[PDB]
Design a protein around this ligand. Structure first.
Ligand code: MYA
Length: 411
């Protein structure tokens, strides 16, 4: 029973989603004038707050909320510790809408108690290729193509309720108020991800992890000894030896991305992402924002061949707090971001990502099996994680697809 989600324009069961064969909206069309102009009522001791993401004080307040209260593993050993610089990056892409960043604070002391953030994204989200095949074989190509134009929608992230206020139905009102503010902008769909099962994902991908410092990872109980290494008398030693990375990048033309690479990176990324059912459309401004290197936040490298950029990869940094370990209190994790390989095998491109991440002191490289990420798991010695990242739409019926048809990276 979902007292909240059963009232919302989402598919309500896996059985329902299994039957969806076209993309399209779920709610009746509405207009902005149908949407209340007043923020939803909230307890008189709390207030809605829209942070100013240019104010160091406001960014710091969000930072501290998430540091102490955002996603935790089930054993409370690790918690994400997004940096202030990362939050300003993730929350403030080009043309972002300040009113889509929704917070609740306590009036008396102005303490931040809850947060949810929406940013604009332009998403291809029309009927998937294989369902269009089946639709065309039914003479319904027209209906299957109705919504192929990229849509300007909302990407939701960073939903967080302070630990002391959990299970008091604050998340539904936060979500409802964000929806109100987005709808008041004439935007009617959103996309979000979660590591938990909600009604009802259109895609789910397993997490995979590449140890860069396997001794540390075993000590902090992030990962175990892979089953294939349990046959050894000293598995950690063999792990270190087989996981040892080349001292140097295998691609001699590798260098950090620079502003003049933006147009070529845009073109090769968009050409690659076009082959996926669900994916973002990025302008030069958005390519610049999301991919140009930013210290401690995002790292992007290009390969030149024949004087031109032919390949690139990116990763971003999310440290996690390690709780209860007497030897370590932080885990430095690199997350595979966007990439495109036009002249070298993808596993050779991503090997250079691992080499660079190791040289920069990261402990582990994490990814979800979206894009073509599954294809280099075995080759580059990634191990399967316990987690799955689920992909969801708000007010968009969508057929179930494999994660290999998803090209939207979530931060
Ligand atoms: C058109 C524009 C639309 C824009 C909006 C689109 C939708 C966006 C949707 C949000 C996308 C977020 C994407 C991310 O950021 S996913 C990461 C979410 N954050 C965390 O896990 C951080 C740590 N946990 C917390 O802060 C709290 O436990 C949260 C805030 C998660 C729940 O707070 P609390 O534990 O105090 O519970 P409650 O009593 O207030 O509320 C219980 C209700 O909340 C439903 N619930 C539980 N977990 C989630 C979840 N992860 N997404 C959506 N709904 C969730 C649950 O099914 C129940 O509804 P129902 O089962 O009774 O019906």
């Amino acid at each position: 029973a979902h007292a909240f989600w059963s009232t919302q324009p989402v598919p309500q069961t896996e059985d329902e989603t299994e039957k969806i064969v076209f993309a399209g909206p779920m709610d009746e069309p509405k207009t902005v004038a149908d949407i209340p102009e007043e923020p939803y009522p909230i307890a008189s001791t709390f207030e809605w707050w829209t942070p100013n993401m240019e104010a160091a004080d406001d960014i710091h307040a969000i930072y501290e909320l998430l540091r102490d209260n955002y996603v935790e593993d089930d054993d409370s050993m690790f918690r994400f510790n997004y940096s202030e610089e990362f939050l300003q990056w993730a929350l403030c892409p080009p043309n972002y809408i300040p009113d889509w960043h929704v917070a609740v604070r306590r009036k008396a002391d102005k303490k931040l108690l809850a947060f949810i953030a929406g940013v604009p994204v332009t998403l291809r989200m029309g009927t998937p290729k294989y369902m269009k095949v089946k639709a065309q074989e039914r003479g319904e190509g027209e209906e299957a193509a109705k919504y192929d134009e990229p849509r300007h929608i909302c990407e939701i992230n960073f939903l967080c309720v302070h630990k002391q206020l959990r299970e008091k139905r604050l998340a539904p009102i936060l979500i409802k108020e964000a929806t109100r503010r987005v709808n008041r902008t004439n935007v009617w769909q959103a996309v979000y991800t979660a590591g938990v099962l909600l009604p009802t994902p259109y895609a789910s991908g397993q997490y995979f992890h590449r140890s860069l410092n396997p001794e540390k990872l075993v000590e902090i109980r992030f990962s175990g000894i892979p089953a294939q290494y349990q046959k050894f008398q000293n598995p950690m030693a063999m792990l270190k030896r087989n996981y040892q990375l080349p001292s140097a990048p295998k691609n001699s033309g590798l260098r950090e991305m620079k502003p003049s690479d933006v147009p070529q990176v845009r073109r090769i990324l968009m050409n690659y992402l076009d082959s996926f059912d669900v994916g973002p459309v990025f302008s030069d401004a958005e390519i610049s924002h999301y991919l140009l290197p930013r210290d401690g936040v995002v790292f992007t490298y290009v390969v030149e061949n024949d004087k031109k950029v032919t390949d690139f990869f990116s990763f971003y940094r999310i440290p996690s707090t390690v709780i209860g370990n007497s030897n370590y209190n932080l885990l430095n994790a690199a997350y595979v971001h966007y990439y495109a390989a036009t002249s070298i095998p993808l596993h050779q491109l991503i090997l250079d990502l691992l080499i660079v991440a190791h040289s920069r002191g990261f402990d582990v490289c994490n990814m979800v099996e979206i894009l073509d990420n599954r294809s280099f798991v075995e080759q580059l010695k990634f191990g399967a994680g316990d987690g799955h990242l689920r992909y969801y739409f708000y007010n968009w019926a969508y057929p179930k697809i494999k994660p290999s048809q998803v090209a939207l990276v979530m931060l």
